[PDB]
């Protein structure tokens, strides 16, 4: 599986049959069909900069992982009752700098897209078994929108050179992704699933009312890592956002 005309999400059916579920991410967000659910508090993200562990490039990917032994970093809020522990941060965009992301908003596609993940410690033993279950992971989304650069991306640009093609990982330590939220504490919240193979319908996501920005230039950035291992021909990480999914008859809430 992967992005291409031959192994890209119109195929993705033919492996896992799931990808044409009832909860599928991600989806367009209409706005004059959102329901204000005033049970919802606001999100509460704690995170410890020490619990910061390694950068990998994944191939189709690059994600920044966290140690996730204790409650040292953690999301409350919204519209949990437990707290999810924080596991890691990963990026979508596009081939273009003008559509990339995955969720859309009355029909309009971002750039990019910012997607922090937690698993439910509070009811599994580990991310392994949590990861299908309906209960068992949360992701923040937070849009991304080109304009003026974002001078918070900085560290996260500069470790990409260590991590150049799949497989390659470093330390990537002392870093508080909270630093890349809007400051904006509205959301829309919805149940569905991880957006790429397994593709599992255990995801509660939080999308931020609020978008973030980033230049062209630190989007062609991530565009340029490879996905071939080191010493083959290159080739480039080009995109990766799936496109969206019919809702199915979900609801999805406002906290305003
Ligand atoms: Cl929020
Ligand atoms: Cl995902
Ligand atoms: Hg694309
Ligand atoms: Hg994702
Ligand atoms: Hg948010
Ligand atoms: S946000």
Request: glycine share 6%.
């Given at each position: 599986?992967?992005?291409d005309?031959?192994?890209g999400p ?12 009832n909860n599928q991410?991600?989806?367009?967000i209409?706005t004059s ?13 704690s995170?410890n900069?020490?619990?910061?562990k390694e950068?990998?490039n994944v191939?189709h990917?690059?994600?920044?992982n ?15 009752s437990?707290?999810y ?7 979508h965009?596009?081939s273009t ?7 859309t ?5 971002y750039?990019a897209?910012?997607?922090v993940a937690?698993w439910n ?11 299908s ?9 937070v849009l ?9 991306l ?14 390659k990982?470093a330390?990537?330590?002392?870093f508080?992704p909270?630093?890349?939220l809007?400051?904006?504490?509205d959301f829309?919240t919805?149940?569905?699933?991880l ?5 599992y ?8 009312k609020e978008?973030?920005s ?6 062609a950035q991530?565009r340029?890592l490879?996905?071939?291992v080191?010493?083959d ?6 995109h990766?956002n799936?496109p ?6 979900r609801?999805?809430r406002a906290?305003?």
């Amino acid at each position: 599986w992967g992005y291409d005309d031959k192994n890209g999400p119109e195929q993705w059916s033919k492996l896992y049959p799931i990808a044409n579920g009832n909860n599928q991410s991600p989806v367009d967000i209409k706005t004059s069909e959102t329901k204000h659910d005033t049970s919802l508090k606001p999100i509460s993200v704690s995170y410890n900069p020490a619990t910061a562990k390694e950068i990998i490039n994944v191939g189709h990917s690059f994600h920044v992982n966290f140690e996730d032994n204790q409650d040292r970093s953690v999301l409350k809020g919204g519209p949990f009752s437990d707290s999810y522990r924080l596991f890691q941060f990963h990026f979508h965009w596009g081939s273009t700098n003008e559509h990339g992301s995955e969720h859309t908003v009355d029909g309009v596609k971002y750039s990019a897209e910012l997607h922090v993940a937690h698993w439910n410690s509070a009811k599994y033993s580990s991310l392994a078994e949590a990861a299908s279950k309906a209960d068992g992971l949360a992701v923040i989304g937070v849009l991304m929108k080109v304009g003026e650069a974002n001078p918070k991306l900085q560290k996260v640009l500069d470790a990409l050179q260590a991590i150049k093609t799949k497989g390659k990982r470093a330390p990537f330590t002392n870093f508080d992704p909270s630093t890349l939220l809007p400051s904006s504490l509205d959301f829309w919240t919805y149940p569905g699933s991880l957006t790429h193979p397994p593709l599992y319908e255990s995801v509660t996501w939080i999308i931020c009312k609020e978008s973030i920005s980033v230049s062209s230039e630190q989007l062609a950035q991530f565009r340029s890592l490879l996905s071939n291992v080191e010493g083959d021909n290159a080739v480039p990480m080009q995109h990766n956002n799936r496109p969206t999914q019919p809702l199915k008859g979900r609801t999805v809430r406002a906290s305003f």
